[PDB]
């Protein structure tokens, strides 16, 4: 459920829209949502988890059955990091395996964020 | 800040157009610089209009020219999605997120009701010596339908019904009968799961 575009501005737009909408679904504090965006990801915080889950599924990085999808993460991180660092992100964050799906979402956000925080979009 | 919706479910005919609305509060003049309007279906982006600009690059190709935000009406706190030639993929749960000072979202349901409303009819004199005629009815819609033939006596006759198809069904029914002039027969398309009985008359 969501979108994937190919120009920084379209992406920044989709970033601000999906962030707002996932705050609306989850209820997450604005400050916690920023920390998520900023890299500061409390993996075990349930509101953090739900926001990670909403937002990764909106950008189709997790599919309906919580499966990590390389296509969607490429579409988002192509705009913040190089091609090879994208390849390395895919392979590193593919090993994340959690039967707790929200815990899985917060851990992927961790794993992605360690390559570049998503607030880096605000910096483009 | 509270986004609202006049109808929670739209029931719209296959091919006929569609406009689904989402209201939101506008006290003073509208400031397009601070408005965001996002429509999505399921696994599908429909409208992403942010800061005056409708992002055409994120809109799904299957909406890429059928759908559009009614920009004139935003100044009326009315975010209206319009969709031309409603197909069968267009059915499902939509969502409208608005952001203008605050932010809210609402969901709308859209069934594409295809009742077997345009019944076609044909009568063929198979045999003028035996008065054998062939009476046909042909209609099209999404829930499959059976066809029941009845003479003027309202006794049930037996006809041959062939059902084919992407998601819309085409149901052709034929009745061979030895009948005289001015006699009336009736082809009813029972749309089964949704009871939308429609009876066409053949004279
Ligand atoms: N005597 C009859 N009314 N026969 C109907 C045959 C219908 C045909 N087999 C079909 O289902 O496509």
Residue numbers in the entry:
A (entry chain B): -4 to 119
B (entry chain A): 19 to 183, 188 to 225
Sentences from the paper on this structure:
Here we use a geometric deep-learning framework operating on protein surfaces that generates fingerprints to describe geometric and chemical features that are critical to drive protein–protein interactions. As a proof of principle, we computationally designed several de novo protein binders to engage four protein targets: SARS-CoV-2 spike, PD-1, PD-L1 and CTLA-4. Guided by these general principles of molecular recognition, we introduce a protein design approach based on the critical importance of the fully buried patches of the interface to drive protein interactions. Overall, our surface-centric approach captures the physical and chemical determinants of molecular recognition, enabling an approach for the de novo design of protein interactions and, more broadly, of artificial proteins with function.
To test our fingerprint-based approach, we sought to design binders to target the PD-1–PD-L1 interaction, which is central to the regulation of T cell activity in the immune system. We used MaSIF-site to find high-propensity protein-binding sites in PD-L1 and, unsurprisingly, the identified site overlapped significantly with the native binding site engaged by PD-1. This site is extremely flat at the structural level, ranking in the 99th percentile in terms of interface flatness (ranked 7 among 1,068 transient interfaces), one of the dominant structural features that makes this site hard to drug by small molecules. Two designs based on two different scaffolds showed low binding signals, which we refer to as DBL1_01 and DBL2_01. Combining mutations from both libraries, we obtained DBL1_03 with 11 mutations from the starting design, which was folded and monomeric in solution, and showed a binding affinity of 2 µM, comparable to that of PD-1 (KD = 8.2 µM). The SSM results revealed that the four hotspot residues placed by MaSIF-seed were crucial, as any other residue was deleterious for binding. To experimentally validate the binding mode, we co-crystallized the designs with PD-L1. Overall, for both designs, the structures showed excellent agreement with our computational models, with RMSDs of 0.8 Å and 2.0 Å for the overall backbone and 1.0 Å and 1.9 Å for the full atom interface for DBL1_03 and DBL2_02, respectively, showing a very high accuracy of the predictions in the interface region. The chemical composition of the designed interface is similar in both designs—around 59% of the surface area is hydrophobic and the remaining area is hydrophilic for DBL1_03 and correspondingly for DBL2_02. Whereas the native PD-1 uses a β-hairpin to engage the site, the designed binders do so through an α-helix motif, illustrating the ability of our approach to explore outside of the structural repertoire of native binding motifs.
